[PDB]
Write a protein that holds these residues in place. Sequence first.
Motif, PDB file in Angstrom:
ATOM      1  N   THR A   1       0.811  -1.201   0.000  1.00  0.00           N
ATOM      2  CA  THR A   1       0.000   0.000   0.000  1.00  0.00           C
ATOM      3  C   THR A   1       0.864   1.279   0.000  1.00  0.00           C
ATOM      4  N   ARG A   2       1.864   1.320   0.880  1.00  0.00           N
ATOM      5  CA  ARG A   2       2.725   2.500   1.032  1.00  0.00           C
ATOM      6  C   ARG A   2       3.500   2.774  -0.254  1.00  0.00           C
ATOM      7  N   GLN A   3       3.928   1.695  -0.905  1.00  0.00           N
ATOM      8  CA  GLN A   3       4.708   1.761  -2.133  1.00  0.00           C
ATOM      9  C   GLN A   3       3.894   2.349  -3.281  1.00  0.00           C
ATOM     10  N   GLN A   4       2.661   1.875  -3.433  1.00  0.00           N
ATOM     11  CA  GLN A   4       1.735   2.432  -4.419  1.00  0.00           C
ATOM     12  C   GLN A   4       1.542   3.928  -4.207  1.00  0.00           C
ATOM     13  N   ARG A   5       1.368   4.327  -2.952  1.00  0.00           N
ATOM     14  CA  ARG A   5       1.267   5.734  -2.621  1.00  0.00           C
ATOM     15  C   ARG A   5       2.558   6.509  -2.894  1.00  0.00           C
ATOM     16  N   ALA A   6       3.690   5.805  -2.898  1.00  0.00           N
ATOM     17  CA  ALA A   6       5.001   6.441  -3.036  1.00  0.00           C
ATOM     18  C   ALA A   6       5.167   7.103  -4.410  1.00  0.00           C
ATOM     19  N   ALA A   7       4.527   6.540  -5.434  1.00  0.00           N
ATOM     20  CA  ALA A   7       4.519   7.152  -6.770  1.00  0.00           C
ATOM     21  C   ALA A   7       3.937   8.562  -6.730  1.00  0.00           C
ATOM     22  N   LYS A   8       2.910   8.745  -5.912  1.00  0.00           N
ATOM     23  CA  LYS A   8       2.209  10.010  -5.826  1.00  0.00           C
ATOM     24  C   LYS A   8       2.877  10.981  -4.848  1.00  0.00           C
ATOM     25  N   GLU A   9       3.130  10.556  -3.611  1.00  0.00           N
ATOM     26  CA  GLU A   9       3.686  11.490  -2.617  1.00  0.00           C
ATOM     27  C   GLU A   9       5.182  11.338  -2.323  1.00  0.00           C
ATOM     28  N   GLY A  10       5.861  10.458  -3.051  1.00  0.00           N
ATOM     29  CA  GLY A  10       7.263  10.181  -2.778  1.00  0.00           C
ATOM     30  C   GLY A  10       7.460   9.338  -1.516  1.00  0.00           C
ATOM     31  N   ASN A  11       8.704   9.276  -1.060  1.00  0.00           N
ATOM     32  CA  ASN A  11       9.125   8.290  -0.070  1.00  0.00           C
ATOM     33  C   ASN A  11       8.601   8.513   1.373  1.00  0.00           C
ATOM     34  N   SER A  12       8.039   9.694   1.635  1.00  0.00           N
ATOM     35  CA  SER A  12       7.347   9.993   2.892  1.00  0.00           C
ATOM     36  C   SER A  12       6.182   9.023   3.167  1.00  0.00           C
ATOM     37  N   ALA A  13       5.744   8.321   2.130  1.00  0.00           N
ATOM     38  CA  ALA A  13       4.672   7.322   2.245  1.00  0.00           C
ATOM     39  C   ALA A  13       5.088   6.133   3.122  1.00  0.00           C
ATOM     40  N   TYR A  14       6.391   5.863   3.204  1.00  0.00           N
ATOM     41  CA  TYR A  14       6.904   4.770   4.044  1.00  0.00           C
ATOM     42  C   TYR A  14       7.115   5.224   5.479  1.00  0.00           C
ATOM     43  N   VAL A  15       7.088   6.536   5.681  1.00  0.00           N
ATOM     44  CA  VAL A  15       7.324   7.149   6.974  1.00  0.00           C
ATOM     45  C   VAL A  15       6.059   7.122   7.827  1.00  0.00           C
ATOM     46  N   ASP A  16       6.190   6.553   9.022  1.00  0.00           N
ATOM     47  CA  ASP A  16       5.088   6.455   9.974  1.00  0.00           C
ATOM     48  C   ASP A  16       5.690   6.004  11.300  1.00  0.00           C
ATOM     49  N   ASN A  17       5.834   6.941  12.231  1.00  0.00           N
ATOM     50  CA  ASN A  17       6.570   6.651  13.462  1.00  0.00           C
ATOM     51  C   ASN A  17       5.761   5.906  14.533  1.00  0.00           C
ATOM     52  N   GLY A  18       4.525   5.537  14.211  1.00  0.00           N
ATOM     53  CA  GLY A  18       3.763   4.636  15.072  1.00  0.00           C
ATOM     54  C   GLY A  18       3.892   3.189  14.626  1.00  0.00           C
ATOM     55  N   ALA A  19       4.640   2.964  13.539  1.00  0.00           N
ATOM     56  CA  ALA A  19       4.720   1.645  12.907  1.00  0.00           C
ATOM     57  C   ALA A  19       5.270   0.535  13.803  1.00  0.00           C
ATOM     58  N   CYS A  20       6.343   0.797  14.545  1.00  0.00           N
ATOM     59  CA  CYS A  20       6.910  -0.217  15.432  1.00  0.00           C
ATOM     60  C   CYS A  20       5.967  -0.511  16.609  1.00  0.00           C
ATOM     61  N   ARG A  21       5.341   0.539  17.147  1.00  0.00           N
ATOM     62  CA  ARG A  21       4.313   0.354  18.173  1.00  0.00           C
ATOM     63  C   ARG A  21       3.163  -0.537  17.684  1.00  0.00           C
ATOM     64  N   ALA A  22       2.743  -0.370  16.425  1.00  0.00           N
ATOM     65  CA  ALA A  22       1.633  -1.158  15.830  1.00  0.00           C
ATOM     66  C   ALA A  22       2.000  -2.620  15.581  1.00  0.00           C
ATOM     67  N   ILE A  23       3.232  -2.865  15.134  1.00  0.00           N
ATOM     68  CA  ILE A  23       3.745  -4.229  14.988  1.00  0.00           C
ATOM     69  C   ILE A  23       3.779  -4.952  16.348  1.00  0.00           C
ATOM     70  N   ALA A  24       4.269  -4.259  17.377  1.00  0.00           N
ATOM     71  CA  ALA A  24       4.340  -4.839  18.723  1.00  0.00           C
ATOM     72  C   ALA A  24       2.950  -5.141  19.300  1.00  0.00           C
ATOM     73  N   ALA A  25       2.004  -4.226  19.093  1.00  0.00           N
ATOM     74  CA  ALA A  25       0.630  -4.391  19.573  1.00  0.00           C
ATOM     75  C   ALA A  25      -0.047  -5.572  18.890  1.00  0.00           C
ATOM     76  N   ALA A  26       0.168  -5.712  17.583  1.00  0.00           N
ATOM     77  CA  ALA A  26      -0.354  -6.866  16.849  1.00  0.00           C
ATOM     78  C   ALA A  26       0.284  -8.182  17.305  1.00  0.00           C
ATOM     79  N   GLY A  27       1.564  -8.149  17.674  1.00  0.00           N
ATOM     80  CA  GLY A  27       2.220  -9.337  18.245  1.00  0.00           C
ATOM     81  C   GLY A  27       1.576  -9.708  19.579  1.00  0.00           C
ATOM     82  N   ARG A  28       1.384  -8.702  20.426  1.00  0.00           N
ATOM     83  CA  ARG A  28       0.796  -8.887  21.742  1.00  0.00           C
ATOM     84  C   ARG A  28      -0.593  -9.505  21.650  1.00  0.00           C
ATOM     85  N   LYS A  29      -1.475  -8.886  20.866  1.00  0.00           N
ATOM     86  CA  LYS A  29      -2.832  -9.401  20.672  1.00  0.00           C
ATOM     87  C   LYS A  29      -2.806 -10.810  20.072  1.00  0.00           C
ATOM     88  N   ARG A  30      -1.931 -11.032  19.091  1.00  0.00           N
ATOM     89  CA  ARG A  30      -1.790 -12.361  18.501  1.00  0.00           C
ATOM     90  C   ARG A  30      -1.354 -13.441  19.514  1.00  0.00           C
TER      91      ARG A  30
END
Length: 257
Positions: free
Chosen positions: A219-248
């Motif tokens: 998804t981020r990559q598809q958006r990258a064509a339009k808004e450039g590489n800031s599409a991969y930037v999201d500083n809640g990302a590691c928190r979200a991976i950890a939360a999904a691990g926890r719930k899993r």
Amino acid sequence: RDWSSPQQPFTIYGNTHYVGTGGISAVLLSSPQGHILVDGTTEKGAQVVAANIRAMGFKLSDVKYILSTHSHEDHAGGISAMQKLTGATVLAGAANVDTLRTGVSPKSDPQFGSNFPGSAKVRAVADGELVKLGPLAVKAHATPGHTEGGITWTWQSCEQGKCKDVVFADSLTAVSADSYRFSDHPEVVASLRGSFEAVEKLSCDIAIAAHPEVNDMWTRQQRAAKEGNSAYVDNGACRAIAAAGRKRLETRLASEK
Ligand code: NA
Ligand code: NA
Ligand SMILES: [Zn+2]
Ligand SMILES: [Zn+2]
């Protein structure tokens, strides 16, 4: 988006490039002094990774290091071939080192029992150890649980003067062979729990998950064509991976009773 499927490579941010398959992340961290490759995908996927590094305009002999997140066949299966093509040294957490040298998991491993080609030139990194190549500095963080020697790798990449903290996030997933029980392995469970905490604390502008869809790579990559590489930037990302691990993990433990 099979584990071994071809995938046109692309820059994620600055000198951080995605060179993996459609289903498994592999990242090339480039410099005029040489490159660091993170993960090898599958045995079949090694050919895709090799093709992809060259399609990005780099030479295989300039890859000096291959870093391994964890030693399951889908991430490490292709490392032996990549090691042969590059002459790189392979770096891994102490506890996965022997799995990488031989291709055979330890009995402690949740997915113990499929194999893959063993790699030459493997050595262990210490938790917190800095891996250095010219301007490149990659830090190892012990994130055990999914495997005992799991390492999450961090660095910074700069695009047009804008520097971001990048995290190649190892898997934090309580998944295993059908007969394996996390309920029977409390120390594995305790490790995973420590790892969620460790990951959600990481300085984390750009997360690349070993399974790329875990942080919406496509998804981020598809958006990258339009808004450039800031599409991969999201500083809640590691928190979200950890939360999904926890719930899993909570889900897995309950289901096992
Ligand atoms: Na490809
Ligand atoms: Na590792
Ligand atoms: Zn795995
Ligand atoms: Zn995997």
